[PDB]
Amino acid sequence: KLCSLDNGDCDQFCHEEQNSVVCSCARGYTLADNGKACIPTGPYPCGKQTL
Amino acid sequence: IVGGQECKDGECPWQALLINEENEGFCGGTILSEFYILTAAHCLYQAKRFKVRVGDRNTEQEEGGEAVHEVEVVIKHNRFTKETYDFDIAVLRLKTPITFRMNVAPACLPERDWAESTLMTQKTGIVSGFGRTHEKGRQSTRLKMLEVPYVDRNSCKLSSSFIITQNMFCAGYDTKQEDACQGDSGGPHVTRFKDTYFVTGIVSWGEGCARKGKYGIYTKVTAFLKWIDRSMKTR
Ligand SMILES: O=C([C@H](CNS(=O)(=O)c1ccc2cc(Cl)ccc2c1)NCC1CCN(c2ccncc2)CC1)N1CCS(=O)(=O)CC1
Ligand SMILES: [Ca+2]
């Protein structure tokens, strides 16, 4: 736990499941395998500058 | 946008411009999804009939990647009134789906709690629009973006000549000449957290533009987060 240590080492939203920290992502993102970083399912995900 | 910076290619994708019968840009807006635009609640007064444009960075030059969408329904916040300007928030549902491309993507809608502590507590923030270059000046052609610092909730109420409800918040500068203005209204205020942007707030109002001792007043998205959903999911 400690979503305030560094966002729980998450990528986006961070929660505290009592015991420890729980990461998650916004519409259009799937939580990576390590349960932290976020992965976009499409080519035009929310929150990303389009290059 | 007073002072600030020019949105280069791809930087401000979530941007959205409401245009009137004369195809004139009067208000801003934020792209939430395919058929949903976030805008101020008062911007639904500034005109009789309007469309919303997307992927436009120049109000004169047809840079190919522009596109216009009609409004299918308008969801204005009931607890609104210009008497107080409380609940300055409106969700628009487009007749046809925004197709995403370069210069046209959406902004993430964060979770209330994590937003109220990680986004809002951030140093700066991003506001943008096609607004005026200075208080009593001309509208802008090119789309601008300004990094406006989060302003102490308390010293927000002093500086102001009007009530500042917790349904809204300050952001901008004291003396420096950077702020939003007529036209930027209804547009976006987004926080940049770990290389991604969220819809932290809506351009609402302010005593002049970049006036010393005054801050730019935005609508608190989190304060309406759950309201925003019910609108998209309709109700
Ligand atoms: O603030 C204004 C305009 C001024 N236009 S502006 O200088 O180009 C301006 C507008 C919005 C800004 C937003 C930000 Cl974040 C920063 C700078 C801004 C600068 N009227 C001034 C004020 C008139 C009275 N108000 C209240 C509020 C609560 N209770 C009572 C009265 C708020 C705005 N509003 C909002 C746009 S409107 O409905 O078309 C006209 C009324
Ligand atoms: Ca154009």
Contact B24, B50 (CB under 8 A): no
Interacting residues of B23 by C-beta distance below 8 A, sequence separation 6+ = none
The reply to whether ligand 1 has any atom less than 6 angstroms from the CB of B84 is yes
- B6 with B37, same domain? no
Identify how the structure was determined: X-ray
> Which amino acid residue places its CA nearest to atom 11 of ligand 1?
B205
Task: From the candidates B56, B86, B88, B179, give the one annotated as an active-site residue.
Answer: B88
- Local structure of B196: helix, strand or coil: strand
- B120 with B202, same domain? yes
The reply to whether ligand 1 has any atom less than 6 angstroms from the CB of B165 is no
Experimental resolution (Å) = 2.9
Cα distance between residue A15 and residue B86, in whole Å? 30
Cα distance between residue B168 and residue B147, in whole Å? 18
Q: Please report residues of B whose CB lies closer than 8 A to that of A51.
A: 9-10, 102
Q: Which two tokens stand for residue B6?
A: 């020019």
Cα distance between residue B154 and residue B232, in whole Å? 33
Contact B100, B67 (CB under 8 A): no
Distance from CA of B101 to the nearest CA of A (A): 7
- Quote the ligand 1 centre to B162 CA distance (angstroms): 11
CA B30 to chain centre: 6
Interacting residues of B16 by C-beta distance below 8 A, sequence separation 6+ = B28, B29, B30, B31, B37, B39, B52, B53, B54, B187, B188
CA dihedral B226, B157, B160, B203 (to 10 degrees): -20
Q: What residue numbers bound the domain in which B151 lies?
A: 1-12+107-222
- Alpha-carbon torsion (A30, A33, A35, A38), positive or negative: negative
What number of residues does chain A have? 51
Does the active-site annotation cover B155? no
List, edge to edge, every strand of the sheet that includes B217-220.
Answer: B5-6, B144-147, B126-129, B188-193, B196-205, B217-220, B168-169
- B20 with B70, same domain? yes
Contact B190, B202 (CB under 8 A): no
Contact B32, B232 (CB under 8 A): yes
CA distances from B96 to A45, B33, B37, B158 (A): 19, 12, 12, 44
Secondary structure of chain A in the HEC alphabet? Answer: CCHHHHHHHCCCCEEEECCEEEECCCCCEEECCCCCCEEECCCCCCCCCCC
- B164 with B201, same domain? yes
Going by DSSP bridges, is the β-strand pair B5-6/A38-40 parallel, antiparallel, or unpaired? unpaired
Task: Classify domain A1-51 by CATH architecture.
Answer: Ribbon (2.10)
CA distances from B112 to A50, B63, B179, B193, B200 (A): 25, 37, 26, 15, 10
Q: Which two tokens stand for residue B139?
A: 């509208």
Cα distance between residue B69 and residue B94, in whole Å? 6
Secondary structure of B46-95 in the HEC alphabet? Answer: CCCCEEEEECCCECCCCCCCCEEEEEEEEEECCCCCCCCCCCCCEEEEEC
Phi, psi of B92, deg, nearest 5: -110, 135
CB contact, 8 Å: B194 with chain A? yes
CB contact, 8 Å: B100 with chain A? yes
Please give the residue of chain B at the shortest CA–CA distance from A25.
Answer: B110
Residue B146 sits at the vertex; the CA angle it makes with B69 and B182, to the nearest 5 degrees, is 60
Cα distance between residue B207 and residue B213, in whole Å? 9
- B24 with B123, same domain? no
The reply to whether ligand 1 has any atom less than 6 angstroms from the CB of B214 is no
- B20 with B50, same domain? yes
Does the active-site annotation cover B140? no
Chain A contact probe: residue of B114, B145, B197, B222 with most A CBs at under 10 A: B114
Contact B148, B189 (CB under 8 A): yes
| DSSP assignment string, B151-191 | P-HHHHHHH-SS---TTEE-BS-SSSS-B--TTTTT-EEEE
Cα distance between residue B89 and residue B219, in whole Å? 7
Q: How many DSSP H helices and E strands does chain B contain?
A: 3, 13
What's B208's domain CATH number?
2.40.10.10
- Quote the ligand 2 centre to B27 CA distance (angstroms): 15
Phi, psi of B153, deg, nearest 5: -45, -35
- B128 with B214, same domain? yes
| Cross-chain Cβ contact A12/B106 below 8 Å | no
Count the domains in chain B: 2
Chain A contact probe: residue of B35, B108, B109, B197 with most A CBs at under 10 A: B108
| Cross-chain Cβ contact B197/A7 below 8 Å | no
Of the candidates B63, B82, B77, B68, the residue with the CA atom closest to the CA atom of residue B10 = B63
Give kind and range of the element (H or E) at residue B114. helix B112-114
- B170 with B129, same domain? yes
- Quote the ligand 2 centre to B7 CA distance (angstroms): 15
